[PDB]
Design a protein around this ligand. Structure first.
Ligand code: HEM
Length: 422
């Protein structure tokens, strides 16, 4: 809709106008948000902010915002100081289920290392090969369904493609039958929508669906203990590292992590990638003329530009002094990947969406280290394949309206993105 010039810096946002602890700030467009973190990186690279308070329930204590690329990298490579426990968000609303929803992402070593090592062993060559074919199969069918279901040539990219694609791939690797997709999608959408303030989500309904998807996953894992199949669920019950195996409860907790951390992340990377290729058509023309050649750099820039995960929280176990800022033990620390992927000291011309950007030390998958995104390369494959099928079946697809943004501090979400093709 609105015309954009590639390489346009964000507006000058004064420091007095930045309120990271107010929900009003997170309702602004990306230009004001980018300009706010740009002012932070320049004038207050590490500052303390209160949490977002909804009038009524508790809010918790504040957090130190790390906006520089080096500070986020330093915090990611020192997990003994920046703990991932109890959780990785600013305020956990259900701390008794922190490990039930989080699985390995809320654990520290050695508990994190033992759990991740066994899960990584379950991704055998046979399981990965099925996952790769599923990415191509699902992306091809979803794009082809867009053409059939919309003879008018107009559709919403989120509901038709960017939404179901990451979750259908997760259901395929877990061996979930096609008839059970209705339950898995509904259960996941209620879980994701529970954080959305715009959608009234009943807390009692949130607990019911969280236990239902957990019971479905434990029963799915128990079924694979008797009936071997070529899915990830079977390999999860058979994987063993140093005599340690996974219980059905642990597998269910990992499945609940995937339907969130491995679902809405890739979704918003696709939507923002389509929005970037639409606002800067010279980049879509470059990639379309040499897709397999520019795919690696284009996917990496889409992740840097989108930054689907806005931040990740850490908890200090000891006192820290970085850039003259003295942070005490027990304080919360938030690693703002949205700001690090625009760091002027790390990226030349950071406001240019360049599908050929090299080098690209982007931290959209995190700053590296122990908790580095387990499905980072799978996410890269999902981004490349979905834009490959769009290039083949509807090469002129383009966004025709400004996106409907998700009101979130943790997810750079797009709720609706109208697109059109010929
Ligand atoms: C654009 C897509 C994605 C983005 C931007 C993303 C982002 C992230 C980030 C920022 C972290 C935390 C890194 C850290 O704390 O240092 C993470 C962890 C994780 N991601 Fe992703 N992710 C994506 C897709 C996926 C997919 C497709 C999967 C699985 C199929 C996945 C599975 C995981 C898991 C299991 C963890 C926790 C690993 C651990 O705690 O050791 N992610 N992701």
């Amino acid at each position: 809709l609105l015309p954009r010039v590639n390489g346009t810096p964000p507006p000058e946002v004064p420091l007095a106008d930045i309120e990271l602890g107010s929900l009003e700030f997170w309702g602004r467009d990306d230009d004001f948000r980018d300009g706010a973190f740009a002012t932070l990186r320049r004038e207050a690279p590490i500052s303390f902010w209160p949490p977002i308070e909804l009038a009524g329930l508790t809010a918790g204590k504040g957090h130190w915002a790390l906006t520089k690329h080096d500070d986020i990298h330093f915090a990611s490579r020192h997990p003994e100081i920046f703990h991932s426990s109890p959780n990785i968000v600013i305020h956990d609303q259900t701390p008794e289920l922190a490990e039930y929803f989080g699985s390995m992402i809320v654990l520290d070593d050695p508990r994190h290392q033992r759990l991740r090592s066994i899960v990584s062993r379950a991704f055998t060559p046979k399981v990965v090969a099925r996952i790769e074919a599923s990415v191509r199969e699902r992306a091809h069918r979803l794009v082809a369904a867009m053409i059939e279901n919309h003879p008018d040539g107009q559709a919403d990219l989120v509901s038709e493609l960017a939404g179901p694609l990451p979750l259908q791939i997760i259901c395929d690797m877990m061996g979930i039958p096609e008839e059970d997709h209705e339950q898995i999608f509904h259960w996941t959408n209620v879980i994701l929508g529970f954080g959305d303030p715009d959608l009234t989500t009943d807390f009692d309904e949130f607990l019911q669906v969280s236990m239902a998807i957990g019971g479905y996953a434990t029963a799915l894992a128990d079924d694979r203990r008797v009936n071997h199949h070529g899915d990830l669920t079977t390999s999860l019950v058979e994987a063993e590292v140093d005599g340690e195996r996974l219980s059905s409860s642990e597998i269910a907790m990992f499945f609940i992590l995937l339907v969130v951390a491995g679902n809405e992340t890739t979704r918003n990377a696709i939507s923002h990638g389509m929005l970037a290729l639409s606002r800067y058509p010279d980049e879509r023309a470059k990639w379309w003329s040499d897709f397999d050649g520019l795919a690696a750099t284009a996917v990496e820039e889409i992740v840097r530009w989108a930054s689907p995960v806005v931040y990740m929280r850490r908890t200090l176990s000891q006192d820290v002094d970085l850039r003259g800022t003295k942070m005490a033990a027990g304080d919360k620390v938030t690693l703002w990947y949205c700001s690090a992927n625009r760091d002027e000291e790390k990226f030349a011309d950071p406001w240019t969406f360049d599908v050929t950007r090299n080098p690209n030390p982007q931290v959209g998958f995190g700053g590296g280290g122990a908790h580095f995104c387990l499905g980072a390369n799978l996410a890269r494959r999902e981004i490349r394949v979905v834009f490959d099928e769009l290039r083949r079946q509807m090469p002129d697809v383009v966004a025709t309206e400004e996106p409907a943004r998700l009101l979130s501090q943790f997810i750079h979400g797009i709720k609706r993105l109208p697109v059109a093709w010929s």
